[PDB]
Amino acid sequence: RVPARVLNSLAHLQDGLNIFMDPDWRQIRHVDDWALAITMESAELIDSYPWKWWKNVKAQTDMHNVRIEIADILHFSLSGEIQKRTQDDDVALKSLKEMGFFCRPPADELLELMFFPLTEVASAVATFRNIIQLASIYRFDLITKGLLLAAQDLDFNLVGYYVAKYTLNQIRQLKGYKEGVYVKVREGVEDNELLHECVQSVSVEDVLNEGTYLKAWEKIACSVFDAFGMPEEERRHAYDWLKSAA
Amino acid sequence: RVPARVLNSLAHLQDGLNIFMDPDWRQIRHVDDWALAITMESAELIDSYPWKWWKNVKAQTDMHNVRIEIADILHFSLSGEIQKRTQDDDVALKSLKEMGFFCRPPADELLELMFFPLTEVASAVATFRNIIQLASIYRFDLITKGLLLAAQDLDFNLVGYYVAKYTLNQIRQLKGYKEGVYVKVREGVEDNELLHECVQSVSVEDVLNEGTYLKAWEKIACSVFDAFGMPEEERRHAYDWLKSAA
């Protein structure tokens, strides 16, 4: 599974995303903001599933949607992890467990909170109710980990996709992007599909490897940049940010 | 505020609503179902408010919507209270409070969880995050009470509206309603407006009075029935249900 420093790099990428919008975000934002947002996004995930026991059911859950909704929550989860280290524990979460206030489907501390496969409603409902509970006690680190475990249940390269997405945003941050100077070499192809083709160029193994993940991330980033028309000079700040230690 | 037996009668009305759909609901449904539904409806309430700190804000929250969304949650809250007494405590909730896992807005055990006025975003967000937390520990009784306190902050006669709504559903349960035999004496007027005019015929005080609330409820029910074309014979089962002891 995911080594601590991959997690730290992921949070560092999120820091950069937040900083572009608000360089002082760590001073303005609070741990309750992230907890709220994970709650609201978790609610929207659960809502893709036919949870209403009183509604007749036409079609099954759209798992493509569940995958991106997991990704949407990861941003807020990473943000809360960083916020939580700006000084906003384990004897608590076990006592919350023995009080019985994490749920389970009907008839590492994390793995009794996560229920698979996510393709089945009761298991997704319990899992994401538990993410909401986790948020509520500021355990952003367990949420982040649970989301990755969840992506893995859905054969979804979350880390890869997150990196691709990180780098599309660096392109969209520049004025050249809105001005139409930087264009897709392959016109018409949607964004989600160019990104997926960019994430395809490396393995899941490659983006999690404790030794050399940074190589694989840079290969994803280089792909996105190539596909979306970012010239060489404008890529350096994103590459340097990528390569920072944590 | 609201006496215990008004609360019990309200839950008894909900029992009847649930029974029409599923007479065996107390055996099939579980405490986690109600907790989930209160969570999902609370999330939709919060979503009427401009909580996204990163979105620019056009228009203020539509409080008419907040009022009905409080009512929507009350159904699930009452249902969970009943379910919780079908055998699915206070030394826990205080320890949850001292662990710090109910929230508050930035810079009776219930009243430090509820924040007013609900017209202001931070106060509504904290309040309804706390309802979600309450749900999560099966404190359906405190949720019910909090919802009433919340209706009171919004000058909303929740009990009145709930009763009106209870009785419109008794009419809609009959085949005559779908067959078009029972019609509004005042054609065209929307449902929500005929109900409000029905709730207007009694005071808030009247529907909470420990001594004589049942009189006032029956006056609301009689109004709704009159307005919606229910003939006398078909009203007896709803009146008898209304009048049951708890």
**Same domain flag for A10 and A62:** no
**Chain B residues closer than 8 Å to A21 by CB:** 54
Are B227 and B186 a contacting pair, CB within 8 Å? yes
Are A61 and A158 a contacting pair, CB within 8 Å? no
Q: Is A121 on the interface with B (CB under 8 A)?
A: no
**Same domain flag for B168 and B152:** no
Tokens representing B59 are 């228009």
Say which CATH number the domain at A229 has: 1.20.1680.10
How many Å is the maximal CA-CA distance in chain B?
Answer: 59
Query: Is the omega angle on the peptide bond into residue A117 within 30 degrees of 0, that is, cis?
Result: yes
Q: What residues contact A23, with CB distance under 8 A and at least 6 apart?
A: none
Q: Do A103 and B40 touch (CB under 8 A)?
A: no
Distance CA A39, CA A30 (A): 15
HSE value, Cβ hemisphere, 13 Å, CA-based, for A121: 13
How many Å is the maximal CA-CA distance in chain A?
Answer: 59
CB-nearest to A101 from B54, B106, B136 is: B136
CA separation, residue B22 to residues A18, A53, B16, B234 (Å): 49, 11, 10, 21
Which of B113, B129, B156 is the C-terminal boundary of a domain?
B156
**Same domain flag for A141 and A83:** yes
**Angle (nearest 5°) at CA B145 between B141 and B149:** 165
A199 membership: H or E segment, kind and range: helix A191-199
Q: Is A54 annotated as a binding residue?
A: yes
Q: Is A192 annotated as a binding residue?
A: yes
End-to-end alpha-carbon separation of chain A, Å?
A: 19
Length of chain B: 246
Q: Do B129 and A43 touch (CB under 8 A)?
A: no
CB-nearest to A36 from B39, B51, B133 is: B51
DSSP string, chain B: ---HHHHHHHHHHHHHHHHHH-TTHHHH--HHHHHHHHHHHHHHHHHTS---TTS---S---HHHHHHHHHHHHHHHHHHHHHHHTT--HHHHHHHHHHT-S-------STTT--S-TTSHHHHHHHHHHHHHHHHTT-HHHHHHHHHHHHHHTT--HHHHHHHHHHHHHHHHSHHHHHT-S--SSTT--HHHHHHHHHTTS-TTTTT-TTTHHHHHHHHHHHHHHHTT--GGGGHHHHHHHT---
**Same domain flag for A13 and A60:** no
Q: Is A130 annotated as a binding residue?
A: no
Q: Which domain holds residue B115?
A: 29-156
Interface test with A, best of B39, B69, B115, B128 (most A CBs within 10 A): B39
**Same domain flag for A104 and A175:** no
Are B15 and B219 a contacting pair, CB within 8 Å? no
**Same domain flag for A133 and A161:** no
Tokens 């006025």 belong to residue: B117
Which of B117, B134, B156 is the C-terminal boundary of a domain?
B156
**Same domain flag for B139 and B93:** yes
Resolution value (Å, 1 decimal)? 2.4
Q: What stretches of A29-179 show up as alpha helix (H) in DSSP?
A: 31-47, 63-85, 90-99, 121-136, 140-153, 158-173, 175-179
Say which CATH number the domain at A50 has: 1.20.1670.10
Phi/psi region, residue A168 (left: phi>0; alpha: psi -120 to 50; beta: rest), is alpha
**Same domain flag for B133 and B218:** no
Q: Is A99 on the interface with B (CB under 8 A)?
A: yes
Tokens representing B148 are 């009433």
**Same domain flag for B81 and B183:** no
Q: What residues contact A142, with CB distance under 8 A and at least 6 apart?
A: A109, A110, A113, A134
Tokens representing A73 are 């929550």
Q: What residues contact B44, with CB distance under 8 A and at least 6 apart?
A: A43, B69
**Same domain flag for B117 and B59:** yes
Q: What residues contact A89, with CB distance under 8 A and at least 6 apart?
A: none
**Same domain flag for A56 and A46:** yes
Q: Is A54 on the interface with B (CB under 8 A)?
A: yes
Q: Do B39 and A136 touch (CB under 8 A)?
A: no
Distance CA A43, CA B36 (A): 10
Structural biology method used: X-ray
Q: Is B72 annotated as a binding residue?
A: yes
Buried b (16+ CB within 10 A) or exposed e, B107-135: eeebeebbbeebeebebbbbbbbbbbbbb
Give me the number of domains chain B comprises. 2
CA separation, residue A8 to residues A78, B56, B217 (Å): 9, 31, 60
Q: Is A47 on the interface with B (CB under 8 A)?
A: yes
Distance CA A225, CA B28 (A): 54
3-class DSSP assignment, residue A169: helix
**Same domain flag for B138 and B179:** no
Tokens representing A127 are 């899992």
Which of B134, B138, B164 minimizes the C-alpha distance to B147? B134
Which of A131, A112, A108, A169 minimizes the C-alpha distance to A46? A131
Distance CA B72, CA B58 (A): 26
**Chain B residues closer than 8 Å to A136 by CB:** 101, 129, 132-133, 136
Which of A137, A156, A175 is the C-terminal boundary of a domain?
A156
Q: Is B35 on the interface with A (CB under 8 A)?
A: yes
